[PDB]
Amino acid sequence: GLSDGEWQQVLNVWGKVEADIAGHGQEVLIRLFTGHPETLEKFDKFKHLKTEAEMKASEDLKKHGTVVLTALGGILKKKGHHEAELKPLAQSHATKHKIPIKYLEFISDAIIHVLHSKHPGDFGADAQGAMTKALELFRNDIAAKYKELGFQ
Ligand code: HEM
Numbered sequence: 752g753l754s755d756g757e758w759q760q761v762l763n764v765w766g767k768v769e770a771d772i773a774g775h776g777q778e779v780l781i782r783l784f785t786g787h788p789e790t791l792e793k794f795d796k797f798k799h800l801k802t803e804a805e806m807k808a809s810e811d812l813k814k815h816g817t818v819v820l821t822a823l824g825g826i827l828k829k830k831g832h833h834e835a836e837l838k839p840l841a842q843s844h845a846t847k848h849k850i851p852i853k854y855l856e857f858i859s860d861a862i863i864h865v866l867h868s869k870h871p872g873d874f875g876a877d878a879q880g881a882m883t884k885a886l887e888l889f890r891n892d893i894a895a896k897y898k899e900l901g902f903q
Pocket residue numbers: 790791793794795796818819820822823839840843844848850854855858
């Protein structure tokens with residue numbers, strides 16, 4: 752449950768991401784994969800990436816980063832009214848990709864890390880609070896769908 756002012760902060764922060772969705776998406780995934788190498792194993796199409804240099808050079812990783820952040824941005828712009836947008840992602844990530852909710856926590860924190868890394872001094876405490884709450888809401892609603900599906 753975010754206030755109007757918190758959603759305003761979220762969407763203000765998101766404008767930073769939308770200016771360079773592929774660069775943000777790439778860095779989010781690289782942060783996820785390098786911080787939590789087990790997550791790489793969930794991607795048949797990225798498990799060949801042995802080094803961060805290879806990850807950085809991967810155009811397909813940037814492409815997927817764009818897909819991920821485009822989806823997330825579409826969800827965030829719903830300001831919590833995202834059941835229709837979230838449902839297929841929860842279902843695909845539980846049933847097809849088999850992504851534990853822990854990895855969604857990892858990527859949520861990776862987003863925060865990337866925002867500070869790319870916008871140092873420009874991702875204020877209020878913005879971090881609002882973005883964190885929005886990612887918690889996202890993760891929590893996914894978690895509810897995971898529970899429905901019995902997925903761990
Ligand atoms: C912000 C959180 C995430 C968003 C918005 C997101 C979004 C997406 C989207 C839109 C797709 C393609 C459509 C689909 O298959 O449903 C996808 C595919 C996929 N996602 Fe995610 N995802 C997120 C987090 C994760 C995490 C944390 C993992 C694993 C650690 C993961 C693993 C995968 C895999 C393996 C695929 C299939 C990739 C392929 O083979 O093309 N996702 N994701």
